[PDB]
Structure 1
Amino acid sequence: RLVREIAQDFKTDLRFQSSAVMALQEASEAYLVALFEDTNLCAIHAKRVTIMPKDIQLARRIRGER
């Protein structure tokens, strides 16, 4: 349902193959798991154990995602 909302803002009256949604979910979760790996490394580097929004922002800054 979330992806349907995002697509409605791009083009109206769209249908999705069930395999298209599953592929979107696969790449999304893999991106988020990998991001939390980099996020956890940043938090440990700051002599901390708890992840914080500054850790994710630092990770995406190093990746070049602005």
Structure 2
Amino acid sequence: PHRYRPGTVALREIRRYQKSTELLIRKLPFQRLVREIAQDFKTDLRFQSSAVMALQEACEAYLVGLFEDTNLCAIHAKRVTIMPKDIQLARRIRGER
């Protein structure tokens, strides 16, 4: 009975998914959430879904750059356990605050 040792799997997922461009969360809960936030000011918002995928890719790539900066915070700590302190640090040094 084998139980795969972690980290090398994460290396393969770095080599695969940081290379790849595909969606991680599935499309339909995403789109439901898109129209869910869209209703907050106005009704009747028909969506050319190409724009929705475009903003999906844009926000996810923003998240990925944020993950990079958060991992920069982690290695600055010389640690591996992640804190939202570090995330807001990445915000304010990014220039959000």
User: Taking structure 2 as the reference length, what is the TM-score of the superposition?
Assistant: 0.63
Deviations 1:18-58 (A, max 9, x none): 10111111101100001000000001101211221111110
Which runs of no fewer than 5 residues in structure 2 stay unpaired? Answer: 1-31
Taking the aligned partners of 1:22 and 1:3, their CA distance within structure 2 comes to: 10
Measure the CA separation in 2 of the matches of 1:41 and 1:50: 12
User: Which structure: larger Rg?
Assistant: 2
Identical-residue share of aligned pairs (%): 97
Structure with more of its chain in helix, by fraction: 1
Aligned position for 2:74: 43
SS in 2 for 1:16: coil
Q: Which residue matches 2:96?
A: 65
The CA distance in 2 between the partners of 1:10 and 1:31, in whole Å, is 25
Check if 1:9 corresponds to 2:18.
no
- Structure 1, unaligned runs of 5 or more: none
Counterpart Cα distance in 1 of 2:62 and 2:34: 16
1: CA distance, partners of 2:96 / 2:35: 24
Secondary structure of the equivalent of 2:78? coil
Moved segments of 4+, more than 4 Å: none
Question: What is the total number of aligned residue pairs between the two structures?
Answer: 66
